Amino acid sequence: HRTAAHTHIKGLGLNSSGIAEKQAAGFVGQCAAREACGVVVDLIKAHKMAGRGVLLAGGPGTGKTALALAISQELGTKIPFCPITGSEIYSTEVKKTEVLMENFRRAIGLRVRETKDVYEGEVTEMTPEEASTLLIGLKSARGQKKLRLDPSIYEAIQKERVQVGDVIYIETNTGACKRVGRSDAYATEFDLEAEEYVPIPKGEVHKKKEIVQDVTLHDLDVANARPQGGQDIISMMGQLMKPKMTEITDKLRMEINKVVQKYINQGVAELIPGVLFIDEAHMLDIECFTYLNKALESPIAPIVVLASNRGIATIRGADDLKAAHGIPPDFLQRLLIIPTHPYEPDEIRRIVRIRAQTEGVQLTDAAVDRVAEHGVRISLRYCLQLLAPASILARVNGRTQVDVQDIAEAEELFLDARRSANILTSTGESGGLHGFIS
């Protein structure tokens, strides 16, 4: 349990009728944006979505990404959520219209249920039956058990160095085997052998457990393009033979859709459409808002929550047009735009109290007003970053709770950006030996 910048966000805090209530689940105020994000969460769960775009306006300091983490904890662990910033789309190995499709294919989720039948235990004998099939007795501390092996899983046992009485761990379903060690009954056969002597497991020999587990479609794309991990031994050279990201063509995705729809029609897997949260969308340039306008029109595309804080700025990559939000109006008509208004002075105190009781820092009511004064007069990100140093100035001076004096000391030890700009301009007047170098 360590505090982040969004630890106190638990959920959107809605009613049963989809109406936001003030000071609920960590948020303070911000009604209409939480109502709209609740509608977005219901749209994601409704499974009637093949590409929808949601933009979040509002300047810096307001709660844009807090809404996104509220959505991410409102969906749960089940439905996949991929947060990427705009600046991650640039690479030096692939084009930047292919990393977008890699994020779209990381967004869609594919849930498979398995019943793994694991076999822990000490090998009793290695008897080749036919001349082929090789029986193995797996002795536990509860009883041994015979086991008939396929002639291909035995060539995976045999590659491992399993001889007489090594404890092993056979997966029955997936056919995965690991040699855990040599059993301690055969420990002191010789006296300085070099193995890992482990005791016989004091449980069952046949443990049957079931596991629900997810796979993203991008992992299917990578595992079908290039051999990965298992038998890819020439990758230890590194220079040309490493697993470099390659240009996954449209034909490969068009076939992987066929195969996944085949395994959904058999009732094996389940499909769950995810969320792609692209943050600070002004860093996306015009060679990607062209490609999003195509890639959202697929019948498989996930919902895209874009976040952008800028005003009428210059679209990157094409310097001769200005547009709102850094988003071209060719693309801006698709988006559902949600506003994010600033904070009143009576709605900053509650954020101070919630952020204080998240970090455990308790403080008197005469200091909450001072932190709210710095929140009104300077910024919201700065006033919340004085609750943690002042507690360090509290338990050192023989106190437990934070008073006005510790914050009056921390405002001098920890200057903000505005007073540093005033010192940088006015106090740092002459550019000489002991001056700043503009």
Partner: protein, 77 residues
């Protein structure tokens, strides 16, 4: 230098090192067949194939000093 290895003190680490960093399938595929395998392939009643069908090491392109860095003082010098 030799390549960097991992000092991990299990038996499995030593087995994985001697199956990746050495990996006898590639060594057999590179250098050629065992002379016992040559005998059982050349005294048999029927022709049989070899998994390294010839020695797949490339011919070195410098006759006097191949694949090493050892220097003998040359006879003229």
């Amino acid at each position: 230098a030799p390549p960097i290895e991992v000092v991990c003190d299990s038996r499995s680490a030593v087995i994985e090192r001697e199956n990746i960093m050495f990996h006898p399938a590639m060594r057999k595929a590179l250098f050629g067949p065992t002379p016992s395998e040559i005998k059982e392939a050349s005294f048999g009643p029927r022709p049989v194939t070899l998994y390294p069908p010839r020695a797949l090491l490339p011919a070195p392109d410098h006759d006097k000093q191949r694949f090493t860095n050892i220097t003998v003082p040359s006879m003229a010098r």
